[PDB]
Design an enzyme around this catalytic site. Sequence first.
Site, mmCIF file in Angstrom:
data_model
loop_
_atom_site.group_PDB
_atom_site.id
_atom_site.type_symbol
_atom_site.label_atom_id
_atom_site.label_comp_id
_atom_site.label_asym_id
_atom_site.label_seq_id
_atom_site.Cartn_x
_atom_site.Cartn_y
_atom_site.Cartn_z
ATOM 1 N N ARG A 36 98.826 47.836 138.591
ATOM 2 C CA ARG A 36 100.217 47.444 138.478
ATOM 3 C C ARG A 36 100.454 46.860 137.084
ATOM 4 O O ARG A 36 99.496 46.523 136.340
ATOM 5 C CB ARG A 36 100.512 46.336 139.468
ATOM 6 C CG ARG A 36 100.592 46.658 140.962
ATOM 7 C CD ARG A 36 102.044 46.985 141.122
ATOM 8 N NE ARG A 36 102.791 45.887 141.605
ATOM 9 C CZ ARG A 36 104.049 45.602 141.436
ATOM 10 N NH1 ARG A 36 105.042 46.143 140.741
ATOM 11 N NH2 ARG A 36 104.325 44.502 142.142
ATOM 12 N N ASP A 61 99.735 40.467 144.877
ATOM 13 C CA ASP A 61 99.642 39.670 143.696
ATOM 14 C C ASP A 61 98.606 38.587 143.872
ATOM 15 O O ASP A 61 97.999 38.231 142.858
ATOM 16 C CB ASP A 61 100.952 38.919 143.419
ATOM 17 C CG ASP A 61 102.197 39.677 142.995
ATOM 18 O OD1 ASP A 61 102.098 40.989 142.877
ATOM 19 O OD2 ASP A 61 103.245 39.044 142.835
ATOM 20 N N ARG A 245 115.510 40.711 134.102
ATOM 21 C CA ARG A 245 115.533 41.249 135.453
ATOM 22 C C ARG A 245 116.494 40.396 136.268
ATOM 23 O O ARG A 245 116.582 39.182 136.045
ATOM 24 C CB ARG A 245 114.158 41.119 136.118
ATOM 25 C CG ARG A 245 114.213 41.294 137.638
ATOM 26 C CD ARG A 245 112.819 41.157 138.232
ATOM 27 N NE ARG A 245 112.810 41.223 139.684
ATOM 28 C CZ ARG A 245 111.676 41.390 140.378
ATOM 29 N NH1 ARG A 245 110.504 41.455 139.799
ATOM 30 N NH2 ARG A 245 111.676 41.436 141.693
ATOM 31 N N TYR A 341 107.612 49.244 137.823
ATOM 32 C CA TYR A 341 107.459 48.704 136.473
ATOM 33 C C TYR A 341 107.223 49.726 135.368
ATOM 34 O O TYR A 341 106.704 50.810 135.624
ATOM 35 C CB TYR A 341 106.443 47.560 136.403
ATOM 36 C CG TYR A 341 106.816 46.260 137.054
ATOM 37 C CD1 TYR A 341 107.612 46.170 138.194
ATOM 38 C CD2 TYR A 341 106.333 45.083 136.479
ATOM 39 C CE1 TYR A 341 107.961 44.953 138.785
ATOM 40 C CE2 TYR A 341 106.645 43.861 137.079
ATOM 41 C CZ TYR A 341 107.443 43.788 138.221
ATOM 42 O OH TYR A 341 107.709 42.551 138.767
ATOM 43 N N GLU A 360 104.599 52.678 136.694
ATOM 44 C CA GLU A 360 103.906 52.637 138.004
ATOM 45 C C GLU A 360 104.264 53.848 138.843
ATOM 46 O O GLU A 360 105.438 54.209 138.997
ATOM 47 C CB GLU A 360 104.291 51.373 138.773
ATOM 48 C CG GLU A 360 103.751 50.107 138.077
ATOM 49 C CD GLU A 360 104.179 48.871 138.821
ATOM 50 O OE1 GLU A 360 105.223 48.773 139.438
ATOM 51 O OE2 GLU A 360 103.309 47.891 138.787
#
EC number: 3.2.1.18
Length: 381
Positions: A36, A61, A245, A341, A360
């Site tokens: 990622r 994560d 974002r 991403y 990704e």
Amino acid sequence: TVEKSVVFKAEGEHFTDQKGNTIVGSGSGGTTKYFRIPAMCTTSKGTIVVFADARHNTASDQSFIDTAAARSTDGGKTWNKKIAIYNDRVNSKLSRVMDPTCIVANIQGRETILVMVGKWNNNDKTWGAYRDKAPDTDWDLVLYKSTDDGVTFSKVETNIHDIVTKNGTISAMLGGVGSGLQLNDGKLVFPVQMVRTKNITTVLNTSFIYSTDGITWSLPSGYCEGFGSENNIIEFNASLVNNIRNSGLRRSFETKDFGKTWTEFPPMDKKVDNRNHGVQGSTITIPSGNKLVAAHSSAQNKNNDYTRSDISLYAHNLYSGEVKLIDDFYPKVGNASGAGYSCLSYRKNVDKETLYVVYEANGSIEFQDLSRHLPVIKSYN
């Protein structure tokens, strides 16, 4: 230079540790399970260096992660890969180095590649949950550099932890994700995102760190609104402009006083909609004659959820405020476990211009050469 290649393949790569022993991940045959957060930097030699989280066991994560690097000297056709930064290996379930942000710069005459990643060891929750300490004792933000065209990386002993500690209102800080920039005056600038201490009303803010030598860094005194916090900064006429974002419409602010105050930047503010939750996106500038054009990549997210479909390239007219979709380069629904991403990279070496993207794709990191789109983009001003 190839039109499209797989940089890192989910359940298809094997890495070794510092001793030479293989890292047995959770993918088939003990491979790294998922990749990622791609970051890409291209050098004056034309070398493409791609970093990404090698999430050995899960896309999650909070899991065991090392920073992988892939280098291509043949236009993205083949990749040589290795681990660039190893986590501390304190906790085998959670030690991690993650979310790279890179810069390719000429520092005092030496072309250098810098990569910055956040580091955690025992925290089992998302970073936003740790707001008691200034800064969190489990956190760190490490910087590595390469001065041999991406072949080897080494830790840079920096004053970043100190600056954060001195400020006293930041629990943790991370790079903006993707790439940072070198300003016309030579300063290195990394966009950053930060979690404020519990006392502050705004949980997240955006800012930047700057340095002239890559060793001593500084934080400006002001802060920009956080939103979804991942962001990139562009330099336009003595203003620094970010692109953040946000769930729904992306946000854009400008600083004309080097970080003290930020105001909305109309040409790019609210121009692209990424739908529910938001996604990280990459924004860079491309010169066209005497002016500048901004190129941006992010997901259309047609399912309006975490699948973040249709990763695309947009051009932004910094003068008129016009936006156009240039190309939907990954017009596919992604994996909800972690998707959408991207990172763009533009360079003009001698007289050769290249525009590349890494993104990704179902746990893998793919590469595409988008140079063909350069004339269209360049006309947007």
